[PDB]
Design a binder for these strands. Sequence first.
DNA 1: CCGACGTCGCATCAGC
DNA 2: GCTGATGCGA
DNA 3: GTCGG
Length: 319
Amino acid sequence: LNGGITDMLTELANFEKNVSQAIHKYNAYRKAASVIAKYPHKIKSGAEAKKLPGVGTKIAEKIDEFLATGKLRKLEKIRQDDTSSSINFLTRVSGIGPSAARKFVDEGIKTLEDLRKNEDKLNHHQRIGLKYFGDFEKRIPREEMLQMQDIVLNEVKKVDSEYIATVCGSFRRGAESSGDMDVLLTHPSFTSESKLLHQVVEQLQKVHFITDTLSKGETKFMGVCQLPSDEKEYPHRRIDIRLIPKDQYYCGVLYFTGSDIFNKNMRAHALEKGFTINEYTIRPLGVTGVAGEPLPVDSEKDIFDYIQWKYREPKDRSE
DNA sequence: CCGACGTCGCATCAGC
DNA sequence: GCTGATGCGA
DNA sequence: GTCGG
Ligand code: NA
Ligand code: NA
């Protein structure tokens, strides 16, 4: 319908992020892309698009140029620019953001092949990102996620049957595929006013599910895992595990379940009901707008009750 | 006209 | 060596 | 780049 347009805008979004380092222009173009990607008509003019929220004068102008000419002179030009296309490309490596990508390209390091010849200039994160560059850009089919989940919950329970672990993200909402695995972990002994993560990562490495570590501290692990394999080996996958204190666990599960759009509406509703919800806690707003103490939460539902909404199933939380 | 555009954990850098 | 800033990803 | 106080 409007794929020419959404791809044009997504493309522009990446050059702002990765090349111009203008994070707010990346989000402007991304949000324009989203609003158009959902508009149920073939767009005829920039003025038509302009009516949608997220589309201003400058994107209206660019849509007019695309509609009339079938391209955008500025994109054509930036696309063919050696420096910029290279910088934009390198940022597809996990661990290389806009600033490292610039630095590499400044010194002549432009390609994956170049990165491979210069391992010594790569931090640990970036080396892992390069090693699995292709695997990381693959989606994970639900079936595989179900098998990953089988392993995580088994090994977690076996370290201590009192841990609670929940796989969140779009998988928890029922998506047919996923980009990574986001595990939320708590234990009754860990509260806000209270090695729990390390023992779980350790057991997942002992059975060779976790193959690599990007980062790991007392509350957050980010790394790489692989299902056990005649068959061709499974792709390596991104898994994060976070340890959240129990009295904030369900605020965390609700947040990390999303979608983004749902959480936004839920936060809207709560405000009008005189509550403030974030990732950690729900709190009452006083008459002048002063937030008081976090309220006890023991299930997701508790949160919905506080703001007089009806428990919605992960499956029904796209908006 | 002009500021907001989430916020934070970890790894690593820059300054002292 | 210590502390706070930065880059990055989420 | 877009919105909005
Ligand atoms: Na508009
Ligand atoms: Na990157």
